[PDB]
C-alpha cells in the first residue's frame, strides 16, 4: 500500500509573554515518530516511536538544527503577516505549516505537498506539479513573487522528490514491524430500545490500523447516507483506531439492515446484521 | 527528516 511521511508545525504568538509557542510533529502514515516543543526542557527534537531511537547523535543534531530554523522562520512570518494585515502587537495569531511525501506500493515517489495557513485560513500552497504556488490574497501574491525570484519551489521540490522519499524508505525498513503491519478491525454490533416503535443499531470497528475505513449502513441493499450517525474516526491510544456508525430503525424490522465495513487489512468487505 | 532551507514569507 501507499505510505506518507508528513511534518506538521504550529507557531502561536503571545505578545507580553515571550517568544511564540512552537510545536512540531512528524508522522509516517498515521504513526507519530518525532516531536519538538519550544517550551520543553531539552530544546531538542525528541523521539516518539521505538524505531527512530536507533538514529545516532548526528541525526538529532541535524533535526534539532532544522526544527529550530523552522521555528525561527515562523517567528518572522508572524511579524511579517502582522504588518501586511495591519494588526496590533497585542493580539495573538497562529501560523500552521504542513509538508511531506507520498509513495506507492513500489515505494517510488507519488506526490509531494506544502501548505501554509495564517489564523486557520489558507495563505499559500505549492501546486501538484511542485513548480508554482497558489496564493490566497494580495499578501500571498506578494510572497509568491518573492519566492519565484528566490527559486524556493525548486529547492523544496528537490527535497520532496529525492530526500523526503529516501528517509521515508529508511523509516519504513527500520520500523518494519509496526509501520508495515495492517490491523484489520475487530467488529461488533449493538442494539438499544428507544422507547416504543424504534431501535438504534450501532456498528463498531475497534483496534484497526491504519485509520482509513469506511462504515456504511444499508436497508435492503440501498445506502442510508442521510439517516446514519457517524462518529469521527478516533485514536484508541495504543497505535490503533476506533469508529462507529449508528442507525435508528423501526422495531422488528432490523434484519433488513446490514452494516458494511471496508478496510486495507480486510481481505474482502465485511457485512454484519443484528444477531440476537 | 525535515527540510533544511525553509523559506520565510
Amino acid at each position: 500500500g501507499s505510505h506518507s511521511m508528513r511534518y506538521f508545525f504550529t507557531s502561536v504568538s503571545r505578545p507580553g509573554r515571550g517568544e511564540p509557542r512552537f510545536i512540531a510533529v512528524g508522522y509516517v502514515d498515521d504513526t507519530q515518530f518525532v516531536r519538538f516543543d519550544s517550551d520543553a526542557a531539552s530544546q531538542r527534537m525528541e523521539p516518539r516511536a521505538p524505531w527512530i531511537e536507533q538514529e545516532g547523535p548526528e541525526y538529532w543534531d541535524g533535526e534539532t538544527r532544522k526544527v529550530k530554523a523552522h521555528s525561527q522562520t515562523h517567528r518572522v512570518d508572524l511579524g511579517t503577516l502582522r504588518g501586511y494585515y495591519n494588526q496590533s502587537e497585542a493580539g495573538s495569531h497562529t501560523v500552521q505549516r504542513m509538508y511531506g511525501c507520498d509513495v506507492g506500493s513500489d515505494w517510488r515517489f507519488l506526490r509531494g505537498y506544502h501548505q501554509y495557513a495564517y489564523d486557520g485560513k489558507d495563505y499559500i500552497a505549492l501546486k501538484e506539479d511542485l513548480r508554482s504556488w497558489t496564493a490566497a490574497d494580495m499578501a500571498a501574491q506578494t510572497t509568491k513573487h518573492k519566492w519565484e525570484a528566490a527559486h524556493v519551489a525548486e529547492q523544496l521540490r528537490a527535497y520532496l522528490e529525492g530526500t523526503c522519499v529516501e528517509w521515508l524508505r529508511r523509516y519504513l525498513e527500520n520500523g518494519k514491524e509496526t509501520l508495515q503491519r495492517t490491523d484489520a478491525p475487530k467488529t461488533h454490533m449493538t442494539h438499544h430500545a428507544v422507547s416504543d416503535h424504534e431501535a438504534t443499531l450501532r456498528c463498531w470497528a475497534l483496534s484497526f490500523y491504519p485509520a482509513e475505513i469506511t462504515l456504511t449502513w444499508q436497508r435492503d441493499g440501498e445506502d442510508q447516507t442521510q439517516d446514519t450517525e457517524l462518529v469521527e474516526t478516533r485514536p484508541a491510544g495504543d497505535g490503533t483506531f476506533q469508529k462507529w456508525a449508528a442507525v435508528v430503525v423501526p422495531s422488528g424490522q432490523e434484519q433488513r439492515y446490514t452494516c458494511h465495513v471496508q478496510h486495507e487489512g480486510l481481505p474482502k468487505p465485511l457485512t454484519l446484521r443484528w444477531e440476537p | 527528516s525535515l527540510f533544511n532551507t525553509i523559506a520565510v514569507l
Partner: T-cell receptor
Amino acid sequence: KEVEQNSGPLSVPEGAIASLNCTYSDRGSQSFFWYRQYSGKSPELIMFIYSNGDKEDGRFTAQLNKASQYISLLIRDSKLSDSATYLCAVRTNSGYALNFGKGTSLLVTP
Amino acid sequence: DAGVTQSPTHLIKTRGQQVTLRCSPKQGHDTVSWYQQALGQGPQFIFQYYEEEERQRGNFPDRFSGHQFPNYSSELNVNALLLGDSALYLCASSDTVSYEQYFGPGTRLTVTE
C-alpha cells in the same frame, strides 16, 4: 575529503569549450554551486543547481547526476577573462554549511 | 544599502597572538557563515550565525570562536595563533528565502615567526 576536484591547471584553447568535473560522496547532497575565484580575490557565485539535469545560463552549462554523484560545469566560447580557479560547493539536507572542493585552475590559452 | 563587508583587509601577527575579524552582511541578509581558505585549497566551514546564535559549527578547534550582534554583523576570534592559521578568512552572507551564500572581500591573515 568529501568534495573532490582536480587542481589542474587545465588548459582550454581560447574559443573552445572548457569542461570541469567535480565529484562528491554524501548521498544527502541536495544543492550544488559553482564559484569562480580570480587570483588574489574572493569566490563569486556563478551558478546554482537544485535539480538533476542540465542547466544553461549564458555560456555556462552545469550538469548534475546525483546517481553517479558528479557535477560538471561547461563554459562555451572561452575567453581570457575566464581564466580563474573554479570551486565546486555542495550543501546537504542536514544543514546550512557548504563543503567545497579544492578548486580547479583553468587557463584559457590564447 | 550594498554588499558584504570585511575588515581588516589584511593582518600580520606573530605566533601565540589573538585576532578579531569583523564581517557585515549584505543589506537584505541576516545570516553569516565564516570560512577559512588556505593557499591552493577550498574554503572550509567554521561557523554560521543566525539571530545572534551559532546555528551550525564546523570541525575547527576551540581556539576559533565567534559572535553575531543585533545589527547582524559578526566577529571571528581566533586565539593562540599558529603559523598554519595563515589564510584568507572569508565571511559569507545569506538570507532566509533563497539561502544562497555570497562571499565578502576577505581578511588576509599572515602569522609569521
